[PDB]
């Protein structure tokens with residue numbers, strides 16, 4: 001009944017919100033200013049305290065010290081090199097050589113040491129955040145998980161069963177099979193459960209534009225990794241980063257091989273990486289280099305084969321546990337109809353047959369809705385199939 | 395002046411170089427292969443002559459170069475394309491080692507695993523003198539190698555290393571070391587504390603990396 | 614601003630009357646409280662006095678710098694415009710949330726301290742790849758397919774407009790769509806109809822322009838393409854003629870075939886990486902389907918595979934009806950003689966005849982198109 005009466009009493013109080021919030025100060029949509037009722041801490045005091053007593057302290061880089069005296073040799077970006085001194089506020093302990101320090105603009109003396117440069121394209125490839133894939137989603141390949149999981153996390157979660165027995169456990173592992181088998185999926189489950197830094201690297205990010213540029217990114221990776229206590233490096237699609245050394249005539253693919261040699265040097269020999277565990281995952285391993293396939297770098301060699309029969313029946317129970325189905329369907333009949341099929345196809349069977357239920361009207365799939373999806377995915381897309389020239393890995 | 399070690403990659407080449415760094419009390423100085431490759435021109439060239447001037451200063455000093463085929467790739471004539479800058483760091487490493495103004499104060503240890511890649515200008519006789527090769531272990535060394543890495547493990551006296559060296563053919567010093575670590579982990583699965591002979595034989599099947607396909611229809 | 618998101622009665626109820634009269638009380642009490650601040654503590658205007666205090670703090674020369682790190686106790690290392698970088702402090706009116714490494718900032722002139730941040734002027738490649746307006750007419754312009762028109766709405770349009778049908782089924786929509794067939798059958802034409810209909814941002818790139826001239830510049834362009842696609846919205850990425858990345862070799866590319874391959878490995882990542890993908894649909898189109906890598910066409914990266922046939926002789930008659938709709942067609946012509954002229958004429962051949970026959974009319978200043986226009990049209994278009 002009171003059709004306008006609720007409306008205009010709604011409208012003015014929705015306006016009376018804005019009409020006084022303009023009288024407080026959030027307005028003047030800025031080009032980089034703050035909320036005005038938030039900066040009141042530095043409004044009178046620290047405006048004249050963080051500015052007028054505090055100075056700029058231009059940052060530099062130290063070449064070396066010398067004996068008998070401080071007399072530090074310093075360096076800046078393009079300008080000259082000076083001979084400098086400390087302040088009183090810092091000890092001469094942590095002014096070690098090759099270290100960035102802040103330096104005043106007048107006397108040129110050292111104020112404070114700095115953290116080193118991180119080369120920010122290496123900073124982005126730290127994962128910081130965990131996916132939602134659990135080992136309960138990697139069904140069908142239980143023995144491959146167990147032989148993997150005893151290398152990555154059991155020395156980290158229990159570093160006493162290995163020490164007191166007196167064995168140094170393996171450090172590297174590669175994961176290889178046909179595509180769509182579950183290689184990248186199983187690596188997501190490791191980053192889910194772990195606790196150390198998980199630094200991922202995709203092998204097509206180390207190809208650079210200059211000469212020797214890509215080999216320096218391999219160092220800055222392992223520089224920040226040795227600072228951490230335990231860390232887990234993930235290499236994906238490493239058939240890009242190096243296959244083999246084959247140089248003939250005109251030197252071709254020479255530049256990528258220097259990046260691959262620097263990676264080999266950071267894994268073995270001469271005061272080693274310590275507590276860093278690597279994890280590669282390739283698609284065709286026949287191209288890879290024999291000096292990289294050597295144990296001590298890539299100890300475990302987990303195979304991801306195609307599921308046999310009970311591997312397949314368990315995958316249907318994963319990708320169709322959460323969908324409206326007829327109760328009386330059997331999955332064991334379906335797994336006999338897909339002889340050499342990947343786990344990726346079995347998911348696409350389940351997602352296709354739900355669409356047939358959405359095609360006409362209905363709300364739950366039937367047994368024949370699966371069979372209409374089997375011959376379309378398996379036997380009608382069989383021209384592509386992606387597998388049979390990858391079982392031979394060529 | 396100048397030695398060269400070469401061979402298959404698991405035969406132990408770093409292992410002598412880490413041995414000699416612990417024996418002589420001189421200035422040991424180590425290098426990576428692709429460390430002498432820089433974006434700006436002349437920086438890789440300047441980086442070489444700084445090293446042989448620093449080892450000139452410490453008059454007892456030996457210098458080590460690992461994975462020399464990063465820079466020592468054979469030169470080639472090509473139009474329209476081709477790297478040149480990496481040849482500059484090599485052509486000074488030829489000269490700064492041997493040629494004009496020689497010296498006998500530093501010794502060079504070089505380690506590669508492939509030799510046919512290399513430019514013959516650095517295999518001449520005087521730049522790299524003694525070219526020693528590291529073959530794969532024949533039979534008796536494989537008994538000796540896995541005896542070394544089985545030192546810290548609780549091994550029962552049921553082991554025949556002459557048998558274990560003989561059921562491991564075509565391995566190298568890395569793979570023989572890799573058997574001792576894998577057999578030391580299979581016993582942790584079954585809860586045993588000592589090592590038996592069958593733990594090593596199961597460790598060999600993991601290092602060989604066989605493919606399991608339903609094959610019991612022979613014989 | 615975002616004061617209350619509840620609207621759910623949607624009637625003349627007392628509850629909608631009561632809720633907003635509660636909010637009427639919370640507003641006026643907030644008003645009358647903050648009214649008493651300037652009554653008892655006038656002390657400034659607060660409209661410009663705190664503003665001009667800031668504006669007299671920050672100098673009239675305002676240099677623009679560049680972040681490269683942040684230390685959280687309001688001082689960070691910033692880069693000057695020259696290259697000599699400093700270690701200045703950060704203010705409190707600086708709203709410390711829009712500070713990423715590489716973001717443009719505002720420094721002081723004297724002590725170079727971080728005053729403000731600057732909005733970015735981006736980008737001369739985002740606006741290259743972003744389709745601004747809707748291209749052309751609707752799905753009614755196509756005619757004759759009717760089986761795969763349903764298929765593309767099934768994967769793109771219906772997941773966006775009706776997000777209820779998949780939830781009641783408990784399913785996720787199919788990921789990738791590829792379109793293949795003989796040349797000129799309407800592959801690019803259907804993607805215009807999707808760009809007509811959708812509300813998502815639509816990104817288009819030819820497969821030929823993925824290849825570059827510098828090393829590593831190719832895979833860098835793929836990484837920043839899917840960067841742009843994710844950072845907007847639900848979005849559609851359309852990649853046209855992706856066989857052209859592999860068939861043609863160009864001497865501008867310094868790396869040979871083993872740089873094309875590293876480009877394809879990066880694209881092979883971006884479709885099914887382990888990173889959380891988000892809401893980005895991918896449409897791909899080609900005519901040489903047997904050439905490209907089957908590792909890229911596996912289910913998981915591309916789910917639906919749609920074939921286009923050559924037009925049938927009753928669907929050809931539909932196409933002549935479409936492209937001769939708004940033209941003053943003289944009654945001399947018979948369209949059925951034009952249908953079986955070529956046994957396998959595409960849909961592109963029909964529009965090529967219909968436009969060129971109109972051009973023959975303007976040579977003689979006419980307004981209608983006769984039969985001998987079409988007689989000399991197919992001699993000009995087809996037979997050469």
Ligand SMILES: Nc1ncnc2c1ncn2[C@@H]1O[C@H](COP(=O)(O)OP(=O)(O)OP(=O)(O)O)[C@@H](O)[C@H]1O
Pocket residue numbers: 137138139140141178179180181182183184185186283315318342343344347885908913
């Ligand atoms: N055993 C499995 N159980 C459940 N899902 C699986 C399984 N194997 C694969 N999948 C499906 O495969 C997809 C991930 O495939 P993944 O990326 O691991 O392929 P891959 O083995 O890495 O090959 P590629 O490198 O070509 O991607 C996921 O959608 C996942 O649902």
Ligand SMILES: Nc1ncnc2c1ncn2[C@@H]1O[C@H](COP(=O)(O)OP(=O)(O)OP(=O)(O)O)[C@@H](O)[C@H]1O
Pocket residue numbers: 754755756757758795796797798799800801802803900924932935959960961962964
């Ligand atoms: N079935 C059709 N219905 C309506 N118009 C069509 C049809 N087929 C082709 N055309 C006309 O042909 C022109 C070109 O079509 P389009 O380029 O989409 O074919 P294509 O297969 O994408 O070509 P290409 O193989 O060269 O990419 C369009 O402008 C359209 O007007």
Ligand SMILES: Nc1ncnc2c1ncn2[C@@H]1O[C@H](COP(=O)(O)OP(=O)(O)O)[C@@H](O)[C@H]1O
Pocket residue numbers: 268269291296402403404405406407408409507539566567568571
């Ligand atoms: N007696 C031995 N003979 C050969 N190799 C050994 C011996 N003892 C240990 N090793 C293994 O050889 C490895 C040395 O690596 P190495 O073959 O020098 O690499 P590369 O030759 O590729 O630089 C060590 O990891 C060590 O485990």
Ligand SMILES: [Mg+2]
Pocket residue numbers: 180183184185885
């Ligand atoms: Mg993968």
Ligand SMILES: [Mg+2]
Pocket residue numbers: 269407408460461505
């Ligand atoms: Mg070595």
Ligand SMILES: [Mg+2]
Pocket residue numbers: 797799800801802
């Ligand atoms: Mg087209």
